[model samples]
Target chain A: RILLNCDMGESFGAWRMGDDVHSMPLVDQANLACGFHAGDPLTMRRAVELAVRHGVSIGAHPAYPDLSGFGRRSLACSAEEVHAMVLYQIGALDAFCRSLGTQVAYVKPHGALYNDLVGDDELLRAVLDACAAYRKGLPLMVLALADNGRELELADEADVPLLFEAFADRAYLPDGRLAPRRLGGAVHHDPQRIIEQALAIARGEAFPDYDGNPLRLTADSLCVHGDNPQSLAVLRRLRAA
Target chain B: RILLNCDMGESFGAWRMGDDVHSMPLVDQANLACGFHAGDPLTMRRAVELAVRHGVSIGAHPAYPDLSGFGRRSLACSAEEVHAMVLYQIGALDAFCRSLGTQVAYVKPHGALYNDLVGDDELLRAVLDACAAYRKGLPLMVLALADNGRELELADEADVPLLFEAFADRAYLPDGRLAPRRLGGAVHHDPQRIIEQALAIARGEAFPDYDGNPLRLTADSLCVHGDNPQSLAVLRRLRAA
Candidate 1:
């Protein structure tokens, strides 16, 4: 059976969208927000407790220290600054977990940091180092860009496990790069189209491009976003399919 | 002019008291919590911003790392532990103040830590040393009973400034010490009685015992508990008197 994971509890300060109550039972894992970009201490604690109550595997979704930018704008920071900031955010979330009687099973970089890590090795190393310093046993994940060795090599270098990722809703290039979101066809919102893509990845088939070239994926975990308008239907159909 | 401050923002979890808005306009200063006893970073930041908006001077209300006891329990910690814990709390609140574009002016130890400073020489020195290390003139306020040649000697030794504080709503012992709360009648909730006592101190009239004998007090600032339900009325009467 394919593993299903959803980005839940992304809401912050009244910008609510995804219904976590309705979506929690449909997913196996939850990416909870640490209070840097989108969550407060109270919000983070509540998310941890909710995830625990619902029997969901929780992961630390640490973002850049950009609440105003929602962690989308990459802040110019050094390797040390990046490492320290990531450690700080993760530690803050860990404190919440300790208080809420739950443990975070994995670490995931969010938004700009995630994008930067897949594309930049230096940034990736800093992230891995930060997590290693805090998360001694947890598996770290990244985008399936083969520019910086394979997932296994990167994980071995950091002395940690890795889960190579593939986006179900976002279209990619033949060269295994995600198509820029600025391009119109990058994010497929159609429920049927999204479900088909997710199913193709789940069934261990080659994901096709507009030119009909296929890129194979071997990810241990699957990714789905809960924020999109038709995301519920897409996620449900993908799980069912 | 007399300086009036309170243990404001004691609200935690869900229960919130202290008519902070009404009392802010009437008080000379606001003693904000530094998250050890009664606050988190969000609550501390919000309190600082509110004090800034209301034009009230801000001070740090630091305590032991005991939230359950509200920093009122005497924890068996070494002097180094005391220093590190207090520094951690102060630095946490200081960062929030930096983010909000303000600075912490003074620090008043809360609960047991406050009461302990009177005789705990090692702990007092450690705290004073920390205050001295705090760049740009941050003063320490010692509890009224803690005022002695020894405390002043340490302050002089450390080259740190001091503010002797007297409680407005409590009775005084013959030695000018606050009547112990354990013995009851500790909280003078009557607004008129509180105003009278506070006014006497403001007029430089020394604290008096039950026999009407003057007990010398060298207090520069008077503090009251704003977390009390009658905090606003007591503050109003103090201001008017």
Candidate 2:
């Protein structure tokens, strides 16, 4: 059975994001924010407590140390840099977790980090180094694709585990890459279309890519968003479907 | 003996800060930045190594999550908020230290956080709580002043050790408070005067504090800055003194 996961707790300082109070109860796993692009320690602690209460698995949603652009803008960073930051974040989150007797079950890079590492070999290896050094068993979650090759080989050689995830609404291209959001049709709009693609991926059935080529993604988890009115209403139907 | 401590590793991402290679050898302790207001994890790791090599005490230099203001601007945060950030930062720094077989010697709030907590009782208590809760023996460093009553009391009541520090170059008022750096004489100019103040505070002697008042500060450490050339030369004389 494929697990459903949602990004939870992206607040920083006084700011708040995502309805974690309600979202935690719905998802099987939570990609809880660690302080980087978003999430302060207190907000992270609250997310952890909420995730535990809902019997949801906890994963560290670490990102670039760019809060200004919310980790969306790519910054040139070295492998050493990527290693230190990813290691530092996981440990910081684990501090809150250990105090509560809970632990981060996995790790998923947020925003640009999630996208950049899929292409930047050096940074990806650095991330793998940090995960391998910090803890061995926890899986490193990344977007699923054939570009996922270098990632898989790096993870395999480094002895780091990978958890491939498929987006429910993001449009995929014929070549197994995400359609750039800048282009039209990159992101599917209708809730009905969103769920159909979601369940289709969930059921292991091929769905038309952006160019209408039949495409199938081999994913262990399906990523869903609950940030707005349309998607919020669609969650119930998707869950039942 | 009064420890001579200086801020080290203030760089974030790829940005560079003070010259640690020369400064680390002269200072007795290093208040290494801990990835909030400044220093990224990789930068922090490098600082720890430098401190260890120099036989300097390694203290965690945490601050408000305000990179825009360099943690120099006050932020409205609750006691709970203060507690979590402090705890999170120390643990993040400790992760690097522990991996290198070292540990944080103490915690000193950076810039505005250092100044704000002296007046904000709630935040000060929260800082104390984090220190006392996370690790027992490590001291919490703050500016030395009579406005320091709550700081001393909270640290005493909470059983968290306090490390009072006097600035080497900044102006001190008759009331044992730092004169705002915005006005004239707020920061000392002459290299002679700066080193004299440092040595006087070190010798446990009273110096004319801004007003011609013979005021002696009870400081466990003297904070020094080595960012520029004028103060850079004074370091040699102060070390000898």
Candidate 3:
């Protein structure tokens, strides 16, 4: 089956996102934010319960401890710090899920960590290690990039399953790198474009850029932006297709 | 009517307080702390709903913006700033009450704000003004040590009702001032003494002094701390009496 996914529970106190309730039904899996960076225990629980209601697979998205930065800025920290933070965020969400008779199916690093994994071997290795150590065994989701082969190697070394993820609403470079969010064309807002890109990756095919350059990627899951304005609509379109 | 009131809805990110399920059955009112001082929005909503489930009056306990100090410290702010913070806190609690299909019947300033009211007219007047501006004449509770003194001046000036509150489990100075909490002998753990004090305040008689003398007081309400160690003992004794 072609799988669709969306980000969920990214809003914090006095802040909000687009309608997640309507989007949950359109997704096969959800990358749930844990409260290290954004989501609180209450919001986390609500998202989990909602995803369960919609029969969608739920996973944890642990970010850097920088709410002001939205976990999108690089921080200098040891691999130990990375491991502890990953374990901490995952454990909290896992405990909450356990109370509701559910389990987190995977771990996906959010924001800066996702960007940092492109080259940081120690950090990526620590993340893979954390996934193995979590009480409930869950795979780690990695951005589908050819150059980040080290992450797959580390996950394999740790005997952790890797869920290769490709963005539903993100533009990619010809070399298979996600365009930096600062770039003008970072996020693909067009629903048709987003769905076309996502479906191509899901079918294990490459997406060629506007410059007629092929972008290589293989996806096991589609990652959606829960906080994006067009998030729910894009998910709906993808599900329909 | 003889009423058993308790302060509740003091839940934080994960921390919680006051067995609301069991306490709700026995209380006539629940003065829930709004997000500014102690409780979060989720906790405030839950507290109001729990009160509804047990058929109890829900009041707003809006404290200082010092959550780090749990709103117990004397905040260094101008009268206008204090007034603004007070309004902000009350507004938050009011929102929670509105969501629960009820309105806050009264307002109580917690901790240092309560202590600051006695013999402090400027701050008292500012709070009184806030109360007048909040929801068109909601009565405010004032700690009932020097009844009709400093707070009465503010009440008369602002044209607001002051619900004179006396403590059932505290020692008062011979001059009718509450014993400073910094002093070791400030609280009365003995339930017999607390019950006597509550009965005295209820009957418009004399409140006890630190030196065991009767300090005359006519209070509209008696306050018993719910989270204090001596609170449950005092509450049980006062009820039995």
lDDT of each: 0.70, 0.81, 0.75
- Clash total of candidate 3: 0
Query: Please, what is the TM-score per model?
Result: 0.54, 0.87, 0.54
Runs in model 2 deviating more than 4 A are A12-16, A40-42, A65-69, A146-149, A237-241, B12-16, B40-42, B145-149, B237-241
- In candidate 1, which residue ranges exceed 4 Å CA deviation? A145-151, A210-212, A238-241, B1-241
Q: Which candidate is the best by DockQ?
A: 2
Q: List pairs with backbone clashes in candidate 3.
A: none
Q: Which prediction has more favorable DockQ, 1 or 2?
A: 2
Clashing pairs in 1: none
For model 3, the stretches where C-alpha displacement exceeds 4 angstroms are A208-212, B1-241
lDDT of 1 by residue, A139-234 (tens): 776776535375557677888777667777778788777776656887778777777777787777876764557877656667777776676765
**Which tens-of-lDDT digit does each residue in A76-138 have in candidate 2?**
877887888887888788777776777888989888788888788888888887877777687
lDDT of 1 by residue, B85-180 (tens): 555455545544554567678888888888788768999998887676554367899876524688889989888888888877877777656666
Better of 2 and 3 by DockQ: 2
